[PDB]
Amino acid sequence: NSLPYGKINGTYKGTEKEKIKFSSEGSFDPDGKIVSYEWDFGDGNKSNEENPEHSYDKVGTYTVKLKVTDDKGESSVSTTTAEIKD
């Protein structure tokens, strides 16, 4: 019955066109298992890797979302930012 806890380990920073390593380490479900991790990098791109690398084409500050869903189909969403400069 218990919702999963996502941990998105923000904030993130890097430079345009250089890969940034994201981590969902510490995410957990008290009464089950997390069966999916869904990242949205805020630049229209997504991943279902636990700990993806992603580069941003353009500078800016992007909203990063991590949606975790458990084995009973229940989800929760964590957010942070990725600040991309020169």
Author numbering: 685 to 770
Text lifted from the article:
Similar to the molecules in the holo s2a crystal, the four apo s2a molecules are similar (average r.m.s.d. of 0.5 ± 0.2 Å), with molecules C and D being the most similar (r.m.s.d. = 0.2 Å) and molecules A and D being the most divergent (r.m.s.d. = 0.8 Å). Molecules A and B, as well as molecules C and D, are related by a noncrystallographic twofold. Temperature factors for each structure are relatively high, possibly as a consequence of the high solvent content in the crystal (61.8%). The holo and apo structures resemble each other (r.m.s.d. = 0.6 ± 0.2 Å). As expected, the most notable difference between the structures occurs near the N-terminus, where Ca2+ reorients the interacting residues Asn685 and Ser686. While neither structure could be refined using anisotropic B factors, comparison of B factors revealed that with the exception of the N-terminal residues, no significant change in B factors occurred upon Ca2+ binding. Unlike s2b or s2, s2a truncates β-strand A through an approximately 126° rotation of the ψ bond of Ile692. To accommodate the change, Tyr696 packs with Phe706 and is involved in a Δ4 Tyr corner, in which the side-chain hydroxyl group hydrogen-bonds to the backbone four residues prior to it. In the s2a structures the termini are the most flexible. As mentioned, the B-factor trends in all holo and apo s2a structures are similar despite the difference in crystal packing.
Clostridium histolyticum collagenases ColG and ColH are segmental enzymes that are thought to be activated by Ca2+-triggered domain reorientation to cause extensive tissue destruction. The collagenases consist of a collagenase module (s1), a variable number of polycystic kidney disease-like (PKD-like) domains (s2a and s2b in ColH and s2 in ColG) and a variable number of collagen-binding domains (s3 in ColH and s3a and s3b in ColG). The X-ray crystal structures of Ca2+-bound holo s2a (space group C2), Ca2+-free apo s2a (space group P61), Ca2+-bound holo s2b (space group P21) and two new forms of N-terminally truncated wild-type apo s2 (space groups P21 and P212121) are reported for the first time. Comparison of crystal structures of ColG s2 with crystal structures of ColH s2a and s2b suggests that despite common tertiary folds, PKD-like domains can be grouped into two subsets.
